[PDB]
Design an enzyme around this catalytic site. Structure first.
Site, PDB file in Angstrom:
ATOM      1  CB  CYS A 127     -23.070 -87.521  -0.063  1.00 42.26           C
ATOM      2  SG  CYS A 127     -22.234 -85.968  -0.451  1.00 42.26           S
TER       3      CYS A 127
ATOM      4  CG  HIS B   4     -20.595 -89.908  -3.192  1.00 37.85           C
ATOM      5  ND1 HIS B   4     -20.880 -88.608  -2.847  1.00 37.85           N
ATOM      6  CD2 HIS B   4     -19.256 -90.076  -3.208  1.00 37.85           C
ATOM      7  CE1 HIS B   4     -19.708 -88.029  -2.650  1.00 37.85           C
ATOM      8  NE2 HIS B   4     -18.706 -88.881  -2.841  1.00 37.85           N
TER       9      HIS B   4
END
Ligand SMILES: CCc1cccc(CC)c1NS(=O)(=O)c1ccc(-c2cc(C(=O)O)co2)cc1C
EC number: 3.4.22.-
Length: 359
Positions: free
Chosen positions: A127, A78
């Site tokens: 992400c 992330h």
């Protein structure tokens, strides 16, 4: 062009405490590790790192970047963007995101600009005097399931097919950006941004300087070997006559698989099972994910059909948290043919400090 040394740090964050879990970093970090090893990089591959673990690993990698060294830092997980800055999110980050809990990409890039590296490739797969920095920023959670059942990210699918080419790294990354632009998922999207300050023809395939006059590469090979020692296979004999073999395999620098197998079962014993239990608390192993019939059931799909049949498997994925010797118990549950209940017997085992736990 020559490299003084070739060092790489690959981090893959998947199992997030407060954010959606990811699947692609597992296969991506694994496949990129083997590919970089083929190009003679000393690779450290780490899964699921916390904020303090990430900061220490990046600082230690930065420390290796002496004059002429080729470095490669890859992060898959992330990411978050906030007013001109990008951040790498560790697995212990709270929800919502906040900068003090994350690693600032611009601060890493700024520290990299101060190095006299022959080549520094910094790739993010998130992400959402020249340092010769080539920065790749992929913002693809999208992935593809292979014929094997493994998840491959979009950036890594194209990267792995071109990484072994003997071409300048910027040219190689531009081909990967073209490949992604042809891909239906990323066709008309800003999926890969490349920033480069590379004035000379450097490639990941460039040879390392000769050992007759440059012994820096040998020292780093000895330090990589030291941090990557697996415990030797061991055989435990039990009072009932059952002999158990404990086997070890490595998936990543901080991920080790332990398996137990029954070498000998006396005829008097109808059924026996050897289980590993009571691991150090810092490892955070949930007993419902240990002692599985297959490696896949533990979350291990790389080094899965390369382990003996009829074993019980346990994945220790947080070896960077181990501050002591790896002491655990081998429990043997056995049954005699004409007996009322199962008999239990326990034996303690010490396998030292395996892989990066040695440091
Ligand atoms: C020369 C080999 C090499 C190649 C590429 C990159 C490196 C440094 C990453 C290293 N050196 S190493 O000795 O193998 C090494 C491996 C892992 C860690 C680490 C710290 C943490 C944590 O604090 O959580 C987790 O892993 C620290 C070191 C010093």
């Amino acid at each position: 062009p020559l490299a003084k040394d070739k060092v790489a740090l690959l981090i893959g964050n998947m199992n997030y405490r407060e954010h959606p879990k990811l699947k692609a970093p597992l296969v991506d970090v694994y496949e990129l590790t083997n590919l970089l090893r083929q190009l003679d990089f000393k690779v450290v591959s780490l899964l699921d790192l916390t904020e303090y673990e990430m900061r220490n690993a990046v600082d230690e990698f930065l420390l290796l970047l002496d004059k002429g060294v080729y470095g490669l830092l890859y992060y898959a997980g992330h990411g978050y963007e906030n007013f001109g800055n990008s951040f790498m999110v560790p697995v212990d980050a709270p929800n919502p995101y906040r900068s003090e809990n994350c690693l600032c990409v611009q601060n890493i890039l700024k520290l990299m600009q101060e190095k006299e590296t022959g080549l520094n490739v910094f790739l993010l797969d998130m992400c959402r005097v020249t340092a010769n920095i080539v920065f790749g920023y992929a913002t693809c959670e999208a992935f593809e399931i292979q014929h094997s059942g493994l998840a491959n990210g979009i950036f890594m699918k194209f990267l792995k097919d071109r990484l072994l080419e003997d071409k300048k790294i910027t040219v190689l990354l531009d081909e990967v950006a073209e490949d992604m632009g042809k891909c239906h998922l990323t066709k008309g999207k800003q999926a890969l941004e490349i920033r480069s300050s590379l004035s000379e023809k450097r490639a990941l395939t460039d040879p390392i300087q000769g050992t007759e006059y440059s012994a820096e590469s040998l020292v780093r090979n000895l330090q990589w070997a030291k941090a990557h020692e697996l415990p030797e296979s061991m055989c435990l004999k039990f009072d009932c006559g059952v002999q158990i073999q404990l086997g070890f395999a490595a998936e990543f620098s901080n991920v080790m698989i332990i398996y137990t197998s029954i070498v000998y079962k006396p005829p008097e014993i109808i059924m026996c099972d050897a289980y590993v239990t009571d691991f150090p608390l810092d490892l955070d192993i949930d007993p419902k994910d240990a002692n599985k019939g297959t490696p896949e059931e533990t979350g291990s799909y790389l080094v899965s059909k390369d382990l003996p049949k009829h074993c019980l498997y346990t994945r220790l994925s947080s070896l960077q948290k181990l501050k002591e010797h790896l002491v655990f118990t081998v429990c043997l549950s056995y049954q005699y043919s004409g007996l009322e209940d199962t008999v239990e017997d326990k034996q303690e085992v010490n396998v030292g400090k395996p892989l990066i736990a040695k440091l």
